[PDB]
Enzyme design. Sequence first.
Site, PDB file in Angstrom:
ATOM      1  N   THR A 154       0.853  -1.221   0.000  1.00 22.97           N
ATOM      2  CA  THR A 154       0.000   0.000   0.000  1.00 22.97           C
ATOM      3  C   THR A 154       0.879   1.259   0.000  1.00 22.97           C
ATOM      4  O   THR A 154       0.685   2.103  -0.900  1.00 22.97           O
ATOM      5  CB  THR A 154      -1.011  -0.027   1.158  1.00 22.97           C
ATOM      6  OG1 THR A 154      -2.017   0.949   0.887  1.00 22.97           O
ATOM      7  CG2 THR A 154      -0.405   0.241   2.519  1.00 22.97           C
ATOM      8  N   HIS A 304      -2.310  -1.569  -6.061  1.00 22.79           N
ATOM      9  CA  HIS A 304      -1.901  -2.963  -6.395  1.00 22.79           C
ATOM     10  C   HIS A 304      -3.134  -3.871  -6.496  1.00 22.79           C
ATOM     11  O   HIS A 304      -4.251  -3.384  -6.230  1.00 22.79           O
ATOM     12  CB  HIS A 304      -0.912  -3.496  -5.350  1.00 22.79           C
ATOM     13  CG  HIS A 304      -1.409  -3.373  -3.950  1.00 22.79           C
ATOM     14  ND1 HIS A 304      -2.402  -4.189  -3.447  1.00 22.79           N
ATOM     15  CD2 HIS A 304      -1.063  -2.534  -2.951  1.00 22.79           C
ATOM     16  CE1 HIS A 304      -2.646  -3.858  -2.197  1.00 22.79           C
ATOM     17  NE2 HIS A 304      -1.837  -2.846  -1.868  1.00 22.79           N
ATOM     18  N   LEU A 673      22.084   3.595 -12.354  1.00 27.76           N
ATOM     19  CA  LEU A 673      22.684   4.645 -13.220  1.00 27.76           C
ATOM     20  C   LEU A 673      24.048   4.166 -13.729  1.00 27.76           C
ATOM     21  O   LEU A 673      24.659   3.302 -13.065  1.00 27.76           O
ATOM     22  CB  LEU A 673      22.827   5.945 -12.423  1.00 27.76           C
ATOM     23  CG  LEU A 673      21.534   6.525 -11.848  1.00 27.76           C
ATOM     24  CD1 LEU A 673      21.814   7.824 -11.107  1.00 27.76           C
ATOM     25  CD2 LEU A 673      20.496   6.745 -12.938  1.00 27.76           C
TER      26      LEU A 673
HETATM   27  C1  LIG Z   1      -2.080   3.733   4.447  1.00 31.99           C
HETATM   28  C2  LIG Z   1      -2.569   5.084   3.964  1.00 31.99           C
HETATM   29  C3  LIG Z   1      -1.724   6.229   4.423  1.00 31.99           C
HETATM   30  N1  LIG Z   1      -1.582   6.510   5.768  1.00 31.99           N
HETATM   31  C4  LIG Z   1      -0.783   7.573   5.861  1.00 31.99           C
HETATM   32  C5  LIG Z   1      -0.331   8.246   6.988  1.00 31.99           C
HETATM   33  C6  LIG Z   1      -0.736   7.800   8.364  1.00 31.99           C
HETATM   34  C7  LIG Z   1       0.504   9.340   6.816  1.00 31.99           C
HETATM   35  C8  LIG Z   1       0.894   9.771   5.552  1.00 31.99           C
HETATM   36  N2  LIG Z   1       1.740  10.889   5.416  1.00 31.99           N
HETATM   37  C9  LIG Z   1       2.562  11.175   4.233  1.00 31.99           C
HETATM   38  C10 LIG Z   1       2.898  12.648   4.136  1.00 31.99           C
HETATM   39  N3  LIG Z   1       3.720  13.103   5.264  1.00 31.99           N
HETATM   40  C11 LIG Z   1       3.603  14.545   5.468  1.00 31.99           C
HETATM   41  C12 LIG Z   1       3.970  15.365   4.248  1.00 31.99           C
HETATM   42  O1  LIG Z   1       3.175  16.188   3.814  1.00 31.99           O
HETATM   43  N4  LIG Z   1       5.190  15.189   3.657  1.00 31.99           N
HETATM   44  C13 LIG Z   1       6.375  14.469   4.140  1.00 31.99           C
HETATM   45  C14 LIG Z   1       6.990  14.908   2.755  1.00 31.99           C
HETATM   46  O2  LIG Z   1       8.149  15.704   2.841  1.00 31.99           O
HETATM   47  C15 LIG Z   1       5.678  15.688   2.365  1.00 31.99           C
HETATM   48  C16 LIG Z   1       3.360  12.376   6.484  1.00 31.99           C
HETATM   49  C17 LIG Z   1       1.921  11.918   6.450  1.00 31.99           C
HETATM   50  C18 LIG Z   1       0.434   9.087   4.425  1.00 31.99           C
HETATM   51  N5  LIG Z   1      -0.395   8.002   4.603  1.00 31.99           N
HETATM   52  C19 LIG Z   1      -0.998   7.139   3.690  1.00 31.99           C
HETATM   53  N6  LIG Z   1      -0.834   7.249   2.307  1.00 31.99           N
HETATM   54  C20 LIG Z   1       0.399   6.736   1.688  1.00 31.99           C
HETATM   55  C21 LIG Z   1      -1.800   7.856   1.576  1.00 31.99           C
HETATM   56  N7  LIG Z   1      -1.871   7.797   0.278  1.00 31.99           N
HETATM   57  C22 LIG Z   1      -2.162   9.072  -0.166  1.00 31.99           C
HETATM   58  C23 LIG Z   1      -2.280   9.307  -1.616  1.00 31.99           C
HETATM   59  C24 LIG Z   1      -1.152   9.279  -2.432  1.00 31.99           C
HETATM   60  C25 LIG Z   1      -1.255   9.491  -3.798  1.00 31.99           C
HETATM   61  C26 LIG Z   1      -2.496   9.720  -4.326  1.00 31.99           C
HETATM   62  F1  LIG Z   1      -2.598   9.927  -5.668  1.00 31.99           F
HETATM   63  C27 LIG Z   1      -3.636   9.753  -3.568  1.00 31.99           C
HETATM   64  C28 LIG Z   1      -3.523   9.541  -2.203  1.00 31.99           C
HETATM   65  C29 LIG Z   1      -2.278   9.855   0.959  1.00 31.99           C
HETATM   66  C30 LIG Z   1      -1.849  11.199   1.182  1.00 31.99           C
HETATM   67  N8  LIG Z   1      -1.580  12.285   1.528  1.00 31.99           N
HETATM   68  S1  LIG Z   1      -2.965   8.928   2.277  1.00 31.99           S
HETATM   69  C1  LIG Z   2      14.783   8.290  -9.999  1.00 31.43           C
HETATM   70  O1  LIG Z   2      14.679   9.700  -9.790  1.00 31.43           O
HETATM   71  C2  LIG Z   2      15.575  10.253  -8.824  1.00 31.43           C
HETATM   72  C3  LIG Z   2      15.309  11.752  -8.735  1.00 31.43           C
HETATM   73  O2  LIG Z   2      15.340  12.340 -10.042  1.00 31.43           O
HETATM   74  C4  LIG Z   2      17.022   9.957  -9.211  1.00 31.43           C
HETATM   75  O3  LIG Z   2      17.921  10.308  -8.147  1.00 31.43           O
HETATM   76  C5  LIG Z   2      17.206   8.475  -9.530  1.00 31.43           C
HETATM   77  O4  LIG Z   2      18.519   8.245 -10.045  1.00 31.43           O
HETATM   78  C6  LIG Z   2      16.175   8.003 -10.541  1.00 31.43           C
HETATM   79  N1  LIG Z   2      16.344   6.585 -10.811  1.00 31.43           N
HETATM   80  C7  LIG Z   2      16.795   6.103 -11.973  1.00 31.43           C
HETATM   81  C8  LIG Z   2      16.908   4.608 -12.043  1.00 31.43           C
HETATM   82  O5  LIG Z   2      17.100   6.808 -12.922  1.00 31.43           O
HETATM   83 CA   LIG Z   3      25.811   3.045 -10.867  1.00 28.19          CA
HETATM   84 ZN   LIG Z   4      -2.661  -1.522  -0.578  1.00 29.12          ZN
HETATM   85 ZN   LIG Z   5      -3.334  -5.234   1.845  1.00 30.75          ZN
END
Ligand SMILES: CCc1nc2c(C)cc(N3CCN(CC(=O)N4CC(O)C4)CC3)cn2c1N(C)c1nc(-c2ccc(F)cc2)c(C#N)s1
Ligand SMILES: *[C@@H]1O[C@H](CO)[C@@H](O)[C@H](O)[C@H]1NC(C)=O
Ligand SMILES: [Ca+2]
Ligand SMILES: [Zn+2]
Ligand SMILES: [Zn+2]
Length: 787
Positions: A154, A304, A673
């Site tokens: 997830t 997934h 890379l």
């Molecule tokens: C299992 C579900 C889940 N639970 C959490 C929790 C508890 C926290 C969490 N975060 C991630 C972001 N982070 C704070 C934040 O703004 N940043 C840290 C980076 O530098 C930017 C900490 C809080 C994401 N979560 C998520 N995720 C991964 C989520 N998916 C999404 C998501 C991602 C992509 C999409 F297209 C749609 C939704 C979320 C958001 N925001 S909620």
């Molecule tokens: C994926 O992106 C990050 C940030 O641009 C970079 O550091 C990394 O090398 C990239 N991975 C590959 C396999 O190119």
């Molecule tokens: Ca390399």
């Molecule tokens: Zn999942």
């Molecule tokens: Zn699951």
Amino acid sequence: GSCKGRCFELQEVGPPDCRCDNLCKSYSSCCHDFDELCLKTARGWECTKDRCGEVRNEENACHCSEDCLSRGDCCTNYQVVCKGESHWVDDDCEEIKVPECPAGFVRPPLIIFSVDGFRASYMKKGSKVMPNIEKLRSCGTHAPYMRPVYPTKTFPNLYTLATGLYPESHGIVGNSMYDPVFDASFHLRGREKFNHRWWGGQPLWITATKQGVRAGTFFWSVSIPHERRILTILQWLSLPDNERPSVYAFYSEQPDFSGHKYGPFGPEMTNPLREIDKTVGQLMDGLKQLRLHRCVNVIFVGDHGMEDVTCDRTEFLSNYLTNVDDITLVPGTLGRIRAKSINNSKYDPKTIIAALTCKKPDQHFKPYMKQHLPKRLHYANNRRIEDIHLLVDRRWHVARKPLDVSGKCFFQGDHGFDNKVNSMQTVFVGYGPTFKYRTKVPPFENIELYNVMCDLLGLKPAPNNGTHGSLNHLLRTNTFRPTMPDEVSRPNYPGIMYLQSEFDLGCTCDDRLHTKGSTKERHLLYGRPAVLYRTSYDILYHTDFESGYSEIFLMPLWTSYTISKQAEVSSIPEHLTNCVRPDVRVSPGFSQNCLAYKNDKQMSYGFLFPPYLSSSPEAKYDAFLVTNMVPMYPAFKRVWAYFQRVLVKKYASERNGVNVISGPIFDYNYDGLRDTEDEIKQYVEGSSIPVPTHYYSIITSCLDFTQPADKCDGPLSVSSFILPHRPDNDESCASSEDESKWVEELMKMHTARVRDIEHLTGLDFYRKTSRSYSEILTLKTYLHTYE
Ligand SMILES: CCc1nc2c(C)cc(N3CCN(CC(=O)N4CC(O)C4)CC3)cn2c1N(C)c1nc(-c2ccc(F)cc2)c(C#N)s1
Ligand SMILES: *[C@@H]1O[C@H](CO)[C@@H](O)[C@H](O)[C@H]1NC(C)=O
Ligand SMILES: [Ca+2]
Ligand SMILES: [Zn+2]
Ligand SMILES: [Zn+2]
Ligand code: NA
């Protein structure tokens, strides 16, 4: 103080001053009245016929009054039951040629509807189970399936969608993680998963905000129901122009939970999918009430799929390792092994790998040192990824001891397997103005989606692992047009200079010649690969193949050649077995010495162009050039010889001829890379000849198989590999038997994209085609899975 009219506010509030946002519950900093103001459940979520034309009651969850539209806080079915409107799902499918938004809207909004554990084959159920989602899929842009990133869990996949980065780059490599520098653990259950230090890259909401585009909540506090989340987004869309955000996100935990408990092919999965559809129906009906149903970009995406996995189908390391209390395992659909404590001295990775390698005939896992994992997984370059990794077969588990796994059986489904497995494949649907109409698109990787969502919002994407332009065929209008990168190193075309007498390489053979004519038109169907870094290399022409020989690495960076359907396959003559002739066009100094290979008892050699498929007996002598040889282990020569001798002809037979671009890869720091000279750890004993870590092969053909490889005016068909240069074949348990049994299985497992090779080689292919560059970017991101 109070959440009087500040419910789900999108601003920041510095301690103290109790906050009423979507994360107040998780840190426990909500006002006392937050629950009895912002989380109102009175009179359900659906308007009734006797509630139509009611006076405003503030305690109600959603309103059924006349002013509710002006206030922008109605129930989603308000107009349907009261104003006699139709459900969005019931309406005829109509093309959206232009975004139909109210005045004040500067850009058409983006709603990301992410569904946890949504299998690609659930769409087969159709309108009977999911009428609303079927309409979105049928009307908008959809793929047969979308490929998640490994591991297919997830957290890594959701944050991959957010950042467009591989889990090893954005740092969320699993639901369970241990960081050795922090000396702390990240888990699905805990407070530590809210700490910012764990999260890397730049997710969509940060990218938008820093470019002046305001974003709604992407995370919802666990105890906020699905109906409230939809209503809150619809309320945010009703805000004034200066306050209203342009990007929103909805996340559902279904149908994952029901998927785990009952299984993928369970009859109990119908209701959870009915539930998801109703939640989508509430959104689309809600958008139609706000007149944003032909304004807003809707992405229906999954993280997934789900496989049939039972507790009785479990492997135990206690049947391999004598001491199980020495190691810590991350068990389930994948395995990550480290030492339980750092105090232990006896802990040897080498002994653990050996003990787990092809012990049982029907072994349902395979151990890997992370650097040796297939390169297409891009799961190595991170300190939270353990050196020892177990790739578990689909429908199976790996635990430490039998007592770790529990009753009869709690779970009938699970995920986290190899991301190329059919059961792990998820969904993508794109409905809205900027997306195309009744359009099926080929399957693509979720790493690409960040670039597309940035294009929808008119944002400059952060440097990510998506190929910008590869998903231009998704969109009605493109804000980004891709350009081929400039060549940094111009090629050399050296003529005859140094005589056979001058070459003292300690070699022997026992035995125009090098010109251009058909060499380019036949053996470069798609143009010369461009070198995108400063290095000295030479273009060498032969009658059978063309190569770009490096003077620094002392071997070809690439070797291009073409085999027809009616092409001949001969044997290497016995009197030319050890034949390796010096190239007069290249200096003795910038050439490999055959003496080095005799001193090195472990390292033999092989040829990038096969002598087996030489046009004439005279042409076979060009295959034995010192500029066409590369360092190869005897163990690997078995794999490479078979490919060249058998499979290269086998492909040409079935695909009506094929063009093959083969060459070495150096990746000792396993960052995916191209290595610089200093980053190469192993050289051939007592020489300056660098040892490749992998060998690639880009096998191109015509999509229309009626037309041959050359004279193909129509689209292109491609398959690629990145075979690991291993001194043993321990990865192949059946390596004792004939090559035909195992060699082909190894290659399909190490299948790759062209972009993967381009990153590892620093080259750019398909520069002279009849195709649009954006179409070539799609061809370069294509992955042959053999599923
Ligand atoms: C299992 C579900 C889940 N639970 C959490 C929790 C508890 C926290 C969490 N975060 C991630 C972001 N982070 C704070 C934040 O703004 N940043 C840290 C980076 O530098 C930017 C900490 C809080 C994401 N979560 C998520 N995720 C991964 C989520 N998916 C999404 C998501 C991602 C992509 C999409 F297209 C749609 C939704 C979320 C958001 N925001 S909620
Ligand atoms: C994926 O992106 C990050 C940030 O641009 C970079 O550091 C990394 O090398 C990239 N991975 C590959 C396999 O190119
Ligand atoms: Ca390399
Ligand atoms: Zn999942
Ligand atoms: Zn699951
Ligand atoms: Na073996």
